Design a protein around this ligand. Structure first.
Ligand SMILES: [Ca+2]
Ligand SMILES: [Ca+2]
Ligand code: NA
Ligand code: NA
Ligand code: NA
Length: 174
């Protein structure tokens, strides 16, 4: 039974929450600057994205969370989602996925269930990035413990690549 299935085609839903932990005003977003329109989604128009580098601005130091609405997983569940680097040639974005059994603030998200740096399969030094191919979309699977109330996706601990993209977040109970 699916308890969450988000394609982002109507943007980040109001039921989800962004946390700008570094405080720069830049978040996970479906309107990445300076274009202000979503990057190409996974077999779809829209995905949600966070920047380590913004064209016409420069390197960023993100600590950005994207948090689900409150979940009921009394016996646990399974998360799947799709992730890619927006620029296949500046691919090395660092992210983690966390579960909380209580609240939905940054301090509630500790002990990553998954933490990785996307694999660079190709590389280029350019001021304007995102000018070639998107990275490959990869599906990830994370098991969620019983009593998980919130899942957070965190883009952090990296700078000076381009953007990380997320799409097609599905959580099933059991
Ligand atoms: Ca989508
Ligand atoms: Ca930020
Ligand atoms: Na949906
Ligand atoms: Na919200
Ligand atoms: Na709260």
């Amino acid at each position: 039974a699916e308890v969450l299935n988000e394609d982002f085609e109507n943007g980040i839903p109001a039921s989800w929450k962004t946390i700008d932990a570094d405080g720069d005003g830049n978040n996970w977003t479906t309107t990445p600057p300076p274009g202000g329109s979503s990057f190409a989604g996974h077999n779809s128009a829209i995905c949600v994205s966070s920047a380590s580098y913004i064209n016409f601005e420069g390197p960023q130091n993100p600590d950005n969370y994207l948090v689900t609405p409150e979940l009921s997983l009394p016996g646990g569940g399974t998360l799947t989602f799709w992730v890619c680097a927006q620029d296949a040639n500046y691919a090395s974005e660092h992210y983690a996925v966390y579960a909380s059994s209580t609240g939905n603030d940054a301090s509630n998200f500790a002990n990553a269930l998954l933490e990785e740096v996307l694999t660079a399969k190709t590389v280029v030094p350019e001021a304007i990035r995102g000018t070639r191919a998107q990275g490959t979309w990869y599906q990830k699977t994370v098991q969620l413990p019983a009593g998980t109330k919130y899942v957070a996706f965190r883009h952090f601990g990296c700078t000076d690549f381009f953007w990380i993209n997320l799409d097609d977040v599905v959580i099933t109970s059991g």
